[PDB]
UniProtKB/Swiss-Prot annotation, chains A, B:
The gene is COLGALT1. Glycans are attached at N48. Ubiquitous with higher levels in placenta, heart, lung and spleen. It is found in: Endoplasmic reticulum lumen. Beta-galactosyltransferase that transfers beta-galactose to hydroxylysine residues of type I collagen. By acting on collagen glycosylation, facilitates the formation of collagen triple helix. Also involved in the biosynthesis of collagen type IV. N-glycosylated. It comes from Homo sapiens (Human). Belongs to the glycosyltransferase 25 family. Changing D32A: Loss of galactosyltransferase activity. Changing D30A: Loss of galactosyltransferase activity. This is Procollagen galactosyltransferase 1. It is linked to Brain small vessel disease 3: An autosomal recessive form of brain small vessel disease, a cerebrovascular disorder with variable manifestations reflecting the location and severity of the vascular defect. BSVD3 patients may have disease onset in utero or early infancy with subsequent global developmental delay, spasticity, and porencephaly on brain imaging. Other patients may have normal or mildly delayed development with sudden onset of intracranial hemorrhage causing acute neurologic deterioration.
Amino acid sequence: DSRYEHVMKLRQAALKSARDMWADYILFVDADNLILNPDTLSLLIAENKTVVAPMLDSRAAYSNFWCGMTSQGYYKRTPAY
Amino acid sequence: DSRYEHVMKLRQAALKSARDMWADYILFVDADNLILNPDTLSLLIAENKTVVAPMLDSRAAYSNFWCGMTSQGYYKRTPAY
């Protein structure tokens, strides 16, 4: 739980320091994600949505988006995955 | 000439600190100008020009815009004033 708390505080601090600096957009990248296409940022900017995330490939069915919450925020396979 | 130099440096510093802060537009107001209309800023923003200045009234023909430079940057009355 302490690791969770630390991650929350760090991300909230990043968001707050992105607001008091007058910069639109903020791209949350982590350590292991390999952004390969050089035009990812422009193609995400050209969509005009508040929150939008590219779909990243993997060696299994795993990716970085869900399709349903069961009752208390748990994964559920929707037939549209 | 020292007063001129000081004014140049101060205004350039203001402009430079307006650029490294990620703020569009910058409204140069001085001490004696009385901005009376509360909608001046919005009506200037809604014009889509780089540099634009409202025409301020005065007790004489004096105002805050010229209409011609003679040879070395001096006033000249154009018939369109």
